[PDB]
Ligand binder design. Sequence first.
Ligand SMILES: *[C@@H]1O[C@H](CO)[C@@H](O[C@@H]2O[C@H](CO)[C@@H](O)[C@H](O)[C@H]2NC(C)=O)[C@H](O)[C@H]1NC(C)=O
Lengths: 64, 42
Amino acid sequence: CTFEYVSFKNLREFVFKNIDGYFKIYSKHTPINLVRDLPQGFSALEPLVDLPIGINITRFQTLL
Amino acid sequence: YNYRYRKPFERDISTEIYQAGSKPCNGVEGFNCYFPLQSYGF
Ligand SMILES: *[C@@H]1O[C@H](CO)[C@@H](O[C@@H]2O[C@H](CO)[C@@H](O)[C@H](O)[C@H]2NC(C)=O)[C@H](O)[C@H]1NC(C)=O
């Protein structure tokens, strides 16, 4: 508890990775025509945050 | 007694016993079963 911080026709994309105690987040957002599968094409995700937290992540879960 | 020792930039405060022996120590201290923290005699 030693760290704390504050700041279907749409597709949100994200990347999460943890390296040498820093946790990094990237994203991209767009409208879309077809909602059941990922749209065939290309655009690149860009950074959001980089957290100095030091934790040993092996699992994750979504919140609805 | 407050000052104690047990990847890069890791931190870990977990209290689970060192199972130094072949014994599954299951929270009980004894020969080769020890609490993970030791204190500097400052
Ligand atoms: C994640 O957990 C592992 C154990 O599951 C930690 O491993 C220890 O890491 C140090 C690094 O210097 C080694 O000297 C120890 O020998 C490792 N222990 C064992 C039993 O292999 C690891 O440090 C943890 N990583 C983070 C980022 O917290």
